[PDB]
Structure formats: structure tokens, C-alpha cells
């Protein structure tokens, strides 16, 4: 039964890793996105006029 | 117009090419160089004007 008990305990830590790195994607895809608009700005609005 | 969109200086034009997955810009741009230094003013009066 210890094989039993520690399937259990690997298959929830497993999803629980798996559902963090989801998170952790999707907010750097945000962050990228925000990150490529304030290079923009940079490369726009101080190295000449708007 | 917007400086540094596409080319590196002042933007001419572009021609369009392929690729496997992709597009390639060919970006023609014109650049200053062979400088010199003077001394300047802002404005000149004659005649009081
Ligand atoms: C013009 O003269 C100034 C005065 O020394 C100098 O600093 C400047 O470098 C000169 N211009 C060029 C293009 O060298």
C-alpha cells in the first residue's frame, strides 16, 4: 500500500506543479506584450517627436 | 514618419520578399555623415528690425 500512497501523493504534487507553471506563463506572455509597448514608447516619444 | 519603426536613420522605402514561414523587409535608409562646425545665430536685426 505504500506504492499506492505515494502514486497518490506524486499524482496531486504533479498537477499542482503543472497548474503553476500555466500561471507563470501566462503572465509573462503579459508582461512580454506590456514590455514590447514601453520599448515602442521609448523608441517614439524621446528619440525625436509625436 | 515615426523615427525608427522601420529602418535605422531616415526611411526611404522597403521592398517585400518571401520566405519558408516568413517575410523578409529590405529597408533603404539615408544617414548623414561627413560633418563640419559652425557658429551660429538666432536672429539678425537691421535697420533696427
Ligand atoms: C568644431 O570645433 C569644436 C571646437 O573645438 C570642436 O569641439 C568640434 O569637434 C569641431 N567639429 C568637428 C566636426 O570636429
Same mark, same amino acid.
Given at each position: 500500500?505504500?506504492?499506492?500512497?505515494?502514486?497518490?501523493?506524486?499524482?496531486?504534487?504533479?498537477?499542482?506543479?503543472?497548474?503553476?507553471?500555466?500561471?507563470?506563463?501566462?503572465?509573462?506572455?503579459?508582461?512580454?506584450?506590456?514590455?514590447?509597448?514601453?520599448?515602442?514608447?521609448?523608441?517614439?516619444?524621446?528619440?525625436?517627436?509625436? | 514618419?515615426? &523615427?525608427? #519603426?522601420?529602418?535605422?536613420? /531616415?526611411?526611404?522605402?522597403?521592398?517585400?520578399?518571401?520566405?519558408?514561414?516568413? &517575410?523578409? #523587409?529590405?529597408?533603404?535608409? /539615408?544617414?548623414?555623415?561627413?560633418?563640419?562646425?559652425?557658429?551660429?545665430?538666432?536672429?539678425?536685426?537691421?535697420?533696427?528690425?
Amino acid at each position: 500500500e505504500a506504492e499506492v500512497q505515494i502514486d497518490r501523493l506524486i499524482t496531486g504534487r504533479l498537477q499542482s506543479l503543472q497548474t503553476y507553471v500555466t500561471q507563470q506563463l501566462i503572465r509573462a506572455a503579459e508582461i512580454r506584450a506590456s514590455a514590447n509597448l514601453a520599448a515602442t514608447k521609448m523608441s517614439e516619444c524621446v528619440l525625436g517627436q509625436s | 514618419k515615426r &523615427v525608427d #519603426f522601420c529602418g535605422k536613420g /531616415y526611411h526611404l522605402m522597403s521592398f517585400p520578399q518571401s520566405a519558408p514561414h516568413g &517575410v523578409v #523587409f529590405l529597408h533603404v535608409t /539615408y544617414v548623414p555623415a561627413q560633418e563640419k562646425n559652425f557658429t551660429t545665430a538666432p536672429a539678425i536685426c537691421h535697420d533696427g528690425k
